[PDB]
Amino acid sequence: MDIIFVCTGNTCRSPMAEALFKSIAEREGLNVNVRSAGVFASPNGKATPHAVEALFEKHIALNHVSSPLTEELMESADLVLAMTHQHKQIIASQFGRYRDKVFTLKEYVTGSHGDVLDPFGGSIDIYKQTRDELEELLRQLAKQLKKDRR
């Protein structure tokens, strides 16, 4: 499968998810291709320092290059997981042909609507908490995706 995680600028939540998930999938023997993008991202940049530091504590390197969402990405993806419901709607407004691939990470995993709240500009600990929440969802996701024959 090809899956993409989406946040606002592709500097914090989605890159963290992308790195955490690749590591988890490897541990689980899940073969999957993982990417990330932002609804409003610059392609300019990298992950925020706190985002990098939070992963570092977990022995995961987050060497990231930010990217906006593109047709190439949306087309190829099997699944697209937004951090928040608003991200999901915005994505749908811009890539209407692909709406059916798009769910929030929490609704897809947990069956209930929820958002992964924005940590941008927050302390290192805000980022750590965000990392922990993603990690918990992602472990559940890896188990689910393993049951996907794609």
Of the candidate CATH numbers 3.30.230.10, 3.40.50.2300, 1.10.1040.10, 3.30.2130.10, the domain formed by 1-150 belongs to 3.40.50.2300
Residue 31 class from Cβ within 10 Å (0-12 exposed, 13-18 middle, 19+ buried)? Answer: exposed
With 0-12 CB in 10 A as exposed, 13-18 as middle and 19+ as buried, what is 37? Answer: buried
Which entry of 7, 99, 149, 150 is annotated as an active-site residue?
7
User: Is 115 marked active-site?
Assistant: no
Q: Which residues pair with 36 in a beta bridge?
A: 5
Closest CA to 20 of 136, 148, 144: 136
The yes-or-no answer on residue 13 being catalytic is yes
The answer to whether 9 is annotated as binding is yes
11 labeled part of a ligand binding site: yes
Resolution in A: 1.8
The catalytic residue among 2, 13, 100, 149 is 13
Extract the runs of DSSP E, i.e. beta strands, from 63-132: 79-82, 102-104
- Residue 104 marked ligand-binding: no
149 carries an active-site annotation:
no
User: In whole angstroms, how far apart are CA 110 and each of 25, 69, 105, 137, 140?
Assistant: 18, 25, 8, 8, 9
Structural domain spans, the chain: 1-150
